[PDB]
Amino acid sequence: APQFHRPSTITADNVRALGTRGLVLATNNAQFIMDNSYPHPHGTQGAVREFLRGQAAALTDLGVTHANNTFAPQPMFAGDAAAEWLRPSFGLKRTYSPFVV
Amino acid sequence: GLFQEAYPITCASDPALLRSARDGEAHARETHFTQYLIYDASPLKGLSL
Amino acid sequence: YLGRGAPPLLDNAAAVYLRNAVVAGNRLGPAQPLPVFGCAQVPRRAGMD
Amino acid sequence: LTEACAAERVVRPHQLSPAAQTALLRRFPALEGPLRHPRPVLQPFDIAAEVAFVARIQIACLRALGHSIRAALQGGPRIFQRLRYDFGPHQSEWLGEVTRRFPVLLENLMRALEGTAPDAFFHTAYALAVLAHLGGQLVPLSDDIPARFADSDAHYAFDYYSTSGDTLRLTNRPIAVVIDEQSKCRFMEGPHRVCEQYLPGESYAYLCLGFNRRLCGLVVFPGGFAFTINTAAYLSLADPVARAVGLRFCRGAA
Amino acid sequence: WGKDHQVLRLSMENAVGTVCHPSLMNIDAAVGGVNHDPVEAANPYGAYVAAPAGPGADMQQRFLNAWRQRLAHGRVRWVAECQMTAEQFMQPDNANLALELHPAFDFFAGVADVELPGGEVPPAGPGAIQATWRVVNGNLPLALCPVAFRDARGLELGVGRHAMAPATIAAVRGAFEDRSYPAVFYLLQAAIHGNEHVFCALARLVTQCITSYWNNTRCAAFVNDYSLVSYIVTYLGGDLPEECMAVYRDLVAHVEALAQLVDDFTLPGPELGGQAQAELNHLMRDPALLPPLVWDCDGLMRHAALDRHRDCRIDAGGHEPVYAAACNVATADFNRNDGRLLHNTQARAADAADDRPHRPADWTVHHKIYYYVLVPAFSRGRCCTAGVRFDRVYATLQNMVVPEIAPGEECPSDPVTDPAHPLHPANLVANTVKRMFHNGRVVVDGPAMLTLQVLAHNMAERTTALLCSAAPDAGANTASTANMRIFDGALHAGVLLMAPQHLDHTIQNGEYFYVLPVHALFAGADHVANAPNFPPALRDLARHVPLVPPALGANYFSSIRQPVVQHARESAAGENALTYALMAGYFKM
Amino acid sequence: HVFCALARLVTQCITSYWNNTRCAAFVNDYSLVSYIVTYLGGDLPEECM
Amino acid sequence: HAGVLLMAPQHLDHTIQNGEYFYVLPVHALFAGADHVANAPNFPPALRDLARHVPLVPPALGANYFSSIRQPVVQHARESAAGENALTYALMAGYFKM
Amino acid sequence: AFRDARGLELGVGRHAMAPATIAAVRGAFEDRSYPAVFYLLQAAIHGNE
Amino acid sequence: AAPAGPGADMQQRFLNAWRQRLAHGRVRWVAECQMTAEQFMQPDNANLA
Amino acid sequence: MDPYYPFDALDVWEHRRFIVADSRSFITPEFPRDFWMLPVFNIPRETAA
Amino acid sequence: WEHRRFIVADSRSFITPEFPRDFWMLPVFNIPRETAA
């Protein structure tokens, strides 16, 4: 479990394994005292970078838990279809309700 | 040249509002919303032409 | 454009467009424009009233 | 020289093999220069060999500057003054700042002398006043030197740097001001630049910096407070090094 | 009357043979004759361009402290907004009377000798009196062009042409000026960031947010982006009541209207110096000027590829541009300093683009219509930009409490009743985005899982302060105006902040968004005067005197100066007027 | 601080008073009226917001 | 023969390919959408603005001067201020022979 | 205006369209979001009753 | 022109064909910005003859 | 911090035609000295090495 | 006429500088024979 009061602990594997349901509570319940005896190898700006690939690649995880919910991703725009020689490539405005009971 | 002056003459912005020049400056329409008139002030005022 | 007085545009494609654009058919617009020394030779209309 | 270094994979032909050196010398005999000279004043086998020829001169003058600035300013100095500019009564409190303002400038002058490109340094007055002196050890290029600079040692030639704000150069032209205890200033004879109208050290927000054919320069501050510097005791330019320098930078006058 | 009982007529087409000679651009002797007997240090706030230094994130606190001194010194050259007409004509109260000489130019006390795209603090000392160039007719000061005269021209062009409905602007003006405005709407805009592919991903969010916020306020929702409003027109225009949908389609049709008012006043003539006829006529057609929010790279590919163009200097690292085709998680290096602008806006990220765009030629012109004109018609001075901490933004975009649904359970619909809904008070913890769906009431449901898979797709690093300069165009470019400059500052990955809300600690004051006034058009009277840690001494100079941080352009070295921007925060004439009026203020000179 | 502590109480008090009267509730204190415009902008009908 | 009137030139959309089902093909200067022609996929970007106020029609369909309706009847329609009721008869009177 | 003038002579006496059918037709032309299923049905029906 | 080829490409073959001369000069019949007495004066209507 | 001076003061009336053995003055500005700011040369972000 | 104050110009007027003792231990006062530049 990554300790949020030392920046020398955040990796992408430790945050992607954490769900986004639990990352709401872990940020507000930490220790206010920032510590500065162990810095980060990519800099402190690189520690924020390592945090956000940890959140962005975790968005597949929160979506795969809802894979019985939404529909197939329709091609939103033209140019995304195989057979082009008689009919065009449609683009489906995804204004619908993605929900499967 | 001696006075470094220049006289204006009978002029306005509408042929509509130029109509009130043929009665003298007694009731000459000076000013409608933007349409402006300057009556003749010159040695040539009141004369034959 | 009757007389030479000014540095022209450096974009020479522009100024030669605007050359005849102004001096298309002015009564005070010359034909065969300015030589090195001499007047612009303002043309003569066929009648004056 | 390519294929004898390409088939041998010699990346730099000072790493060329000793038989592979001289066999090329048995073929083409003009290469004894770039292979067998102890210290050629032009660098052998480099692309920026003419550029590295220039940057040394940029370096070697700055040390001739930088160890000469320390020379006249060894300890606590007595500079008292050298020009004649009288004060109003509340004008002395401006120099109350100049006491406090002073030592940050002499870093940032030399920082700006570092900060210029050397290609942009050769248009300034010190880079041509040395050429008026290396021609005296020949007319240098662009003829910025007047006809009467080569007459006396009292004909100096200034540059102008900004005192406040940023420490920046405020000239295009070397402004040659003839200087007479005390001595009052006088211009020379004569497309419009702002600062070029004043005497050296005449007013605030101006650093004035003149040089000579004798190459004894001045650093003139506002208020007469100026002093000579013997940069001639610190210019160490070897003449065979300097003779490729001057010929590229002189002009044979008719 | 002639020499008869005969009428005569003198037009202003009469004035063709006098005003059109190439001596209007002949001011060589003017700058020389005024130059002697110099002027002292006129504390050059608006009379100096700074090159950018460092990131944009701290650039205020540079310029706040750098001009902490010569800002409370005196006044700027303009005070004439308080001056009535003929108070300029009188000998007192205008020391700058002897400095107003040309109708096409300006003589003002600027810096002496320091070359302009460089340095931060100019050496206050002796001064110089040079030029800039008056670009469009609106730059004349407002004692010479009356304010009522600007509306006089505007209304009478208003006839014959399409106008906004009088009802629908009340929705927009309420929306633009809404204080309690749901801050997802600032965040979800930077989420899409103009990417069309991320838009048609997230169309249910776009559907419901406008649908929810309409019931709170009869107002549009997302409206500070032309691209975003343009996408709502096409890809969303089906699932709405017409009353809501009328607002956007009227908005574009009025931008359709204000677009083709240029070319009714044009003549067919040849292409010229690279530019077209329309580009030389009006300011909105010249591509060297580019809008303050540029998400793609169509602009500089048009702008820097011009004969007018000189050194678009992006200054955090390397000064000259080289660009990105696409951008993703590993490409949006959220805090960098190189100057690479992103092209990640089109529908086809698979058919990517670095050199060949996707958009029409009027696309940026439409943004130049929407940003430079319409937003000041609703601003009255109150709007300003924002520089984006996308690292802070992309933390909290993908930060939602959307629970798992039960096997056999229904769809989340309502927040207060349904416990499975993301906006439910059981699902409300602070510092998550469905709490930010809840801070302003925006009903957005359980199918919001479709967002994050594409939120992980495309992202953008951080904004940058792009400074493009240019020469006077073919048609004004004589041998005394060749050296002249027009500085045009704009941000790439930036968002407009309509309503400055700082009397509220919900977004703490400048967390996601450092303000960065990119221009006098967007200069926060309440944004900038209420910044992060802050001098109180400038409070006088904040209530007026638009604080333009001088990396982003100066008061005199741009296309749009102070005279028109007061005119924006002045006369109470209608929206239909000021749209045409400021447009009429944009006719080149 | 105590405003958002009891902000639901502020919301119900206004609209219940808005049901009886076409009148605003807390105009007696601008510091309060600054808050409702700032904080409770979602949970009100537009007719009294 | 088997043609169809397109009202709105929609080029602000890549859902249908722009002219997939329907190649544009202007048949007269009455029918030349400024966003149909200029925003076709194969359009010369050197001819943008001159396309805006000129109805580009290939001369196999008719030029201006040998059409029965010339440019002035077209230019009345796009430019006149009047509402469509007056505008109806005002161009309806524009068809009485000479 | 002259070409619109004699329309205002002929505008009397004959049928004038309703105000509702003015904006409904005109907004349909200017509907950029006009659904393209309607174009293909117009080619499907192809004049065949 | 004669009706050439199929209808699918005849405009698209046209814009390649007529790209040269159609940009060369401005055509005669775009004079709709000309007003009355701008026309009847000899400049600005070289087509007055 | 005051610079040293040998003499205190004099007051000389100077006739304009009667300037003989000429001298000059020193120029100090009009604004207060808080504005004549410090000499600043910052180290750039990139260095030579 | 013209009216202003006046001080006699002599070479006994000195403006006093100070030093922080590290001023000559600067990177530009102490430059080697070749630079990294």
XYZ file of N, CA and C in Angstrom, chain G residues 36-80:
135
model
N -21.199 23.648 -49.411
C -21.138 22.421 -50.197
C -19.857 22.356 -51.010
N -19.612 23.385 -51.816
C -18.579 23.317 -52.838
C -17.199 23.472 -52.230
N -17.024 24.477 -51.372
C -15.698 24.781 -50.848
C -15.210 23.719 -49.876
N -16.125 23.014 -49.218
C -15.755 21.986 -48.259
C -16.035 20.578 -48.762
N -15.927 20.361 -50.074
C -15.848 19.045 -50.690
C -14.453 18.498 -50.409
N -14.266 17.173 -50.382
C -12.943 16.637 -50.004
C -11.833 16.959 -50.989
N -12.131 17.023 -52.272
C -11.126 17.369 -53.265
C -11.459 18.751 -53.799
N -11.016 19.770 -53.073
C -11.235 21.155 -53.445
C -9.893 21.865 -53.391
N -9.547 22.670 -54.387
C -8.274 23.381 -54.358
C -8.277 24.455 -53.288
N -7.326 24.404 -52.349
C -7.245 25.462 -51.334
C -6.700 26.776 -51.863
N -6.292 26.839 -53.130
C -5.962 28.117 -53.736
C -7.203 28.851 -54.224
N -8.345 28.178 -54.279
C -9.572 28.785 -54.767
C -10.653 28.866 -53.703
N -10.310 29.311 -52.495
C -11.273 29.288 -51.402
C -12.212 30.489 -51.452
N -11.662 31.701 -51.360
C -12.502 32.886 -51.189
C -13.226 33.236 -52.478
N -12.603 32.957 -53.625
C -13.255 33.251 -54.895
C -14.415 32.291 -55.118
N -14.385 31.147 -54.443
C -15.548 30.287 -54.452
C -16.702 30.845 -53.638
N -16.450 31.772 -52.711
C -17.496 32.129 -51.755
C -18.572 33.007 -52.386
N -18.186 33.986 -53.198
C -19.183 34.829 -53.838
C -19.265 34.624 -55.344
N -18.893 33.453 -55.846
C -19.093 33.078 -57.244
C -19.707 31.685 -57.281
N -20.831 31.494 -57.962
C -21.434 30.156 -58.066
C -20.725 29.260 -59.066
N -19.722 28.513 -58.608
C -18.935 27.634 -59.470
C -19.803 26.509 -60.027
N -19.989 26.521 -61.347
C -20.748 25.505 -62.053
C -19.911 25.086 -63.253
N -19.643 23.799 -63.440
C -18.982 23.331 -64.664
C -19.829 23.621 -65.883
N -19.218 24.076 -66.980
C -20.019 24.596 -68.101
C -20.733 23.535 -68.923
N -20.753 22.276 -68.493
C -21.603 21.312 -69.172
C -23.057 21.472 -68.762
N -23.312 22.192 -67.676
C -24.657 22.366 -67.157
C -25.230 23.735 -67.466
N -24.414 24.644 -67.965
C -24.847 25.994 -68.234
C -23.978 27.012 -67.522
N -23.639 28.059 -68.262
C -22.930 29.212 -67.741
C -23.945 30.256 -67.304
N -23.443 31.440 -66.959
C -24.323 32.500 -66.492
C -25.139 33.071 -67.640
N -24.485 33.365 -68.754
C -25.103 34.241 -69.736
C -26.075 33.513 -70.644
N -25.970 32.199 -70.745
C -26.904 31.432 -71.539
C -27.905 30.683 -70.687
N -27.943 30.965 -69.397
C -29.043 30.494 -68.585
C -30.250 31.396 -68.797
N -31.435 30.849 -68.531
C -32.639 31.666 -68.571
C -32.712 32.615 -67.388
N -32.049 32.280 -66.291
C -31.988 33.115 -65.101
C -30.536 33.503 -64.905
N -30.259 34.789 -64.878
C -28.893 35.231 -64.710
C -28.634 35.555 -63.243
N -27.414 35.968 -62.950
C -26.975 36.421 -61.634
C -27.855 37.441 -60.891
N -28.473 38.466 -61.526
C -29.266 39.427 -60.728
C -30.457 38.856 -59.992
N -31.103 37.826 -60.520
C -32.209 37.228 -59.788
C -31.677 36.451 -58.596
N -30.495 35.860 -58.749
C -29.832 35.192 -57.638
C -29.459 36.204 -56.565
N -28.901 37.338 -56.985
C -28.342 38.284 -56.033
C -29.426 39.025 -55.261
N -30.607 39.201 -55.866
C -31.767 39.707 -55.135
C -32.107 38.834 -53.941
N -32.032 37.514 -54.113
C -32.547 36.602 -53.102
C -31.696 36.624 -51.842
N -30.383 36.520 -51.999
C -29.499 36.425 -50.845
C -29.313 37.749 -50.123
N -29.693 38.870 -50.737
C -29.237 40.156 -50.227
C -30.385 41.036 -49.753
N -31.598 40.818 -50.260
C -32.709 41.705 -49.931
C -33.138 41.524 -48.484
